[PDB]
Amino acid sequence: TWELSVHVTDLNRDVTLRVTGEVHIGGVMLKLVEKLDVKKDWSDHALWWEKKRTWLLKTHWTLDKYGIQADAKLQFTPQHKLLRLQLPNMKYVKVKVNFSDRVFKAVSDICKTFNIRHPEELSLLKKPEALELEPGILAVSQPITSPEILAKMFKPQALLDKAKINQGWLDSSRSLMEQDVKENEALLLRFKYYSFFDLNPKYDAIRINQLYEQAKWAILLEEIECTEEEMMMFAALQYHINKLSIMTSENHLNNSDKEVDEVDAALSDLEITLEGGKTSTILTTDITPECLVSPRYLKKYKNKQITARILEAHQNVAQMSLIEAKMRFIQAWQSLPEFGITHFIARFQGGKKEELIGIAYNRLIRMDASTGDAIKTWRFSNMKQWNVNWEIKMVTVEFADEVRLSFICTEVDCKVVHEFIGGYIFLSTRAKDQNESLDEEMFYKLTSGWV
């Protein structure tokens, strides 16, 4: 007859109970509701064991089966808790989500209510005026208010500082409660894996918009490098998207793919002269560079000279539909040399410095921490298996023909790296999949089934 302490988080009231290993979780919860006497809606409350970071959800299991013994300290706490999510468009949305669900499932439910297909590509990332949803508002891009906003958060980083952000990717196989996430905390919702399956304008207005927004901020903040010519084309595309995204007279077509010829100001062919195509459908633009290029451009060049280069690039964009332009922006980003690599600090045998391991959808890359250069590449198509040695925090990947790669990371980075490798192998299976729905069972096997 050992003692069981229970703190009720939303009442801030403690309760002791005399129990055996053979008492059921349901019995503790029913016993606990009596001893309190006060009656309220308990339906969302579950037992949580902070010491072992374990939810005690199965009411028909014994304390013994969950491993609880003398003077164990539990919380009786709501499973659902407020979370602030920062979307790829940098707006915050408040959601009350189940802090006992696996993060993979939480992300799936978030993406379902946001109408984002392929939730397996997205996840939650810890951070280093909340948006109230309107119909289809997550499909709508806005211009940036101010160069100041951009200039402010434009704090350029070395690759090593960029690699440290990746320590914060949540474990998809554990709940938010298990990962030191608190009520009212802000998490980033991001595209995590850079292998985007079947982007389809017919179904994916929101998915394409949020992916475009993630790309746009990465380019404007120089988190990914591009050439000056590419920057001028990114500027022309953003200008065109911003202009088409004005829809004053309708609220119900946010998910539609707007055509230039549909804009109120558009001139029909043959309206001005029986010479079609002699003038632009939009006769007048208002291109200015300040919110279309990264801050380094306005330091290098006169406003007039940047404007002329954007106008030159815009010649190619002016007849694109809204979603066509977003997809061309995404396709130009996908073509960038360092696209789709996630960096981790790593040490290699014979290395005297911190280096990087880069993970991409099809390969691992040993990379220089101060140039970003690819020193060596190993292909997933050659991978047999991998080992995590938790005592020395060493990942060893085995490839065909007796090729082995070993590197050392922080313990947190090892866990994140393991999930990225399994996650990308899981994503590579989607092309051959004959199931109607996502094979979540295989995802969990490839990422958490082993260790």
Swiss-Prot record:
Keyword Nucleus tagged: yes
Keyword Cytoplasm appears in the UniProt entry: yes
PROSITE patterns recorded: PH_DOMAIN
Membrane topology type: Peripheral membrane protein
Sequence segments annotated as region (Interaction with membranes containing phosphatidylinositol phosphate): 24-65
PTM annotation (Phosphoserine): residues: 256, 268, 437
Stated name of the protein: Fermitin family homolog 2
GO terms (BP aspect): adherens junction maintenance; cell adhesion; cell-matrix adhesion; focal adhesion assembly; integrin activation; integrin-mediated signaling pathway; limb development; negative regulation of fat cell differentiation
Induction record: By serum in lung fetal fibroblast cultured cells.
Source species: Homo sapiens (Human)
An annotated GO cellular component: I band
